[PDB]
Each structure stands twice: as structure tokens, then as C-alpha cells.
A paper describes a structure:
Clathrin mediates vesicular transport between post‐Golgi membranes in eukaryotes and is targeted to specific membranes by interactions with clathrin adaptor proteins. A total of 3 consensus clathrin‐binding peptide sequences have been identified and structural studies show that each binds distinct sites on the clathrin heavy chain N‐terminal domain (NTD). We have solved high‐resolution structures of NTD bound to peptide motifs from the cellular clathrin adaptors β2 adaptin and amphiphysin plus a putative viral clathrin adaptor, hepatitis D virus large antigen (HDAg‐L). Surprisingly, with each peptide we observe simultaneous peptide binding at multiple sites on NTD and viral peptides binding to the same sites as cellular peptides.
Residue numbers in the entry:
A (entry chain I): 1 to 6
B (entry chain G): 3 to 10
C (entry chain E): 1 to 7
D (entry chain A): 4 to 363
The structure:
Amino acid sequence: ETLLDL
Amino acid sequence: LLDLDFLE
Amino acid sequence: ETLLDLD
Amino acid sequence: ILPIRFQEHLQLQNLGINPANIGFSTLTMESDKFICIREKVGEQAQVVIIDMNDPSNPIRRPISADSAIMNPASKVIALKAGKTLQIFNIEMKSKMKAHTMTDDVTFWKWISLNTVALVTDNAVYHWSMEGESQPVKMFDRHSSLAGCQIINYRTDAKQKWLLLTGISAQQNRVVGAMQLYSVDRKVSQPIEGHAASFAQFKMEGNAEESTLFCFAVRGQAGGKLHIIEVGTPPTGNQPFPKKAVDVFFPPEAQNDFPVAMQISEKHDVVFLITKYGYIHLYDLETGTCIYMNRISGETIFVTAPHEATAGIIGVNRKGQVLSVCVEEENIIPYITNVLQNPDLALRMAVRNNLAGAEEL
């Protein structure tokens, strides 16, 4: 899905 | 290597 | 084809 | 006292370099060891190779290439003309390698001592110089970079986290588009960003280094710097808590944006340079802004690590070759006394074995 959450 | 002054 | 001439 | 030191190494115009060739497309500096400049003198295209250990004696050789990038450590030079890529060992007068691509290469760079990264309109490849290796595709480009000018490509130390950066004009500003790719997950993430670097950082109380991704962006909301761990922490490690801090632009710099980043793992600090020549220094651990000033009137368009000082070296449009690094005797008393931050001062003093926190 996503690599990073910021 | 020449020391430089900052511009501000 | 030779992209650099070293001679 | 100032926490950074600013040095001029060279003025390229003193070596007879035409200022029209002092620019992103014609001047490359893949490490602090060499500068290559593509020039046309009369009818003949040439490359001028400046050895930074012997700079008053540049060599000039005829070329028929649209781009030349020197290896970071050795006098081994990559050149290309359209789809033709060739690698030469200069001192052996030898064509090491040749490869014919099926797409033009719009951007390339050495990403290690032995690997060249190749960016086409559609994908990114790595090409190892070891043995009989040919280019291997790493990932396909994300549509968010379509039509961008590609300005950078970098990786983490283990080449498992890959980052492509382009820019374009949108709503009358220069907008950054990045593509972060995980080799292990085979997943990309589009991220608005202008300049970035990876770094290894070992948190106190962890047995293993964390791999951090740091990027700076001027977004519609304003400037921000992010420091975030990529990947799953090594077994046993605590995770690195992500940090995010403002990146300041003064009122007269309304069209400025970040253009370069280098991270010193000697001092665990982040150097950021902006398009219109401001230098910022941040703590890698906390993101805290340690220092800002102006180092160039002209844009600094290419940078590299400055190995001896673990700083940053760059060339500006006038052809000044300049470096910035931590002033090891001043940084701690600067943070204690000018920033009034004894907590950061004491941490950095013991973290990187710097003098000055004997008094806080």
C-alpha cells in the first residue's frame, strides 16, 4: 500500500 | 583554501 | 563509435 | 563564533572555463575529487577534467558525448551519446565497457564506487561495473514525475530504498515530485519534495543502525523538513520517532526552494542549500534548526559530500567551488549560548565527541 506515513 | 565571509 | 579520444 | 566554516577551493574562470559551460547540463561533480566540464572550443567538443588534488593542471580531451560523469573515486569516466554508453579508464587509455540502451538516458549519476544509475523517460536502472554486468531495471517511473526535469537520484547505503526527484512549473512555482521505491516491497510512493538524502543513524540503546530518509520541501503551506525511518526496524531496535520541522524562507525569498542536501554522519547534521544560495544546518536526530545564513548570490547547482570535513561542497554559476562544514570548536558553545539550547548542546557534545559542553 504505502511506504511512509507523515 | 580561502576562508569566506557569509553574505548575511 | 568511441566517445572519448585518449590518443 | 559561528557553528559552520565556509571555504573557497577554486574559481573555475581562473582555469579558462567559459561561464556558459558552468551549469547543470555541462558541469558534473560526482564527488569532491573531480570536476568535469563539457566545452566546445572552435569545432571540437571536449571534456575538461579538473583533478581537485591538482587543480591548476586540468586535462582536455576531445569527446563526442552529450554527458560525462567521473567515478567518485577513480579516473574512470562514463560518457554517453543518445543510447550509447561507454566507460573509460583514463590512465589505461582503455574502453572498459560499452552498452547500447533502447531508450535515451535523461539523467545519470554514480550512486556508489562501482554502480551507475540510469534514468530514462520510463524507468530507472542500475549498472554495476563489476565483471560482465549489464543494466538491471530497478523500477518503473511513477506518473507523478511525467514531464519533470529529473534533478537527482539517490539511495540508502544498502541500495534497498531508492529516490528519484524531478521538478516542474505548477501554478507559477517550482514544484518537486519524488518517487520513493522499496526494492524489497516492490512498491513506490509519490511524495512532494525538493531535496533529500538517506542516512544511517544509531539511536542510543539500539544495537543496530536505523536507516533514515530526510527530505525538505517548499509546499503550498510553506517549508518543511522531515526525518523518518524507512523500513521495519532491525530486530530488537526501538523505532526512530519521525521528526518534522519548519524550513524558513525570508520574505524577499518568496520564490526560493531547497535544491541540495548532504548529511554528515560524523556530526549527525543535515546541510540544506536553497536555490538562491542560503545554507541551513539541522540536527539529524531532532530536526532542530542550528543555523541559517547566505553562502552564495548565485545558485549552487551541483553538490557532493566534502569527505575530509564531512561537509558539503558545491559549484555556483560563477564557477566558485565552495564548501561548508561544521566548526568543531564552535558548534557546541554556539548552541549553548546563541541558541540558548543547552540540552541539544550537551547531547551533541557527547553524541559526536565534540568539545564545549564542559560548561552549559
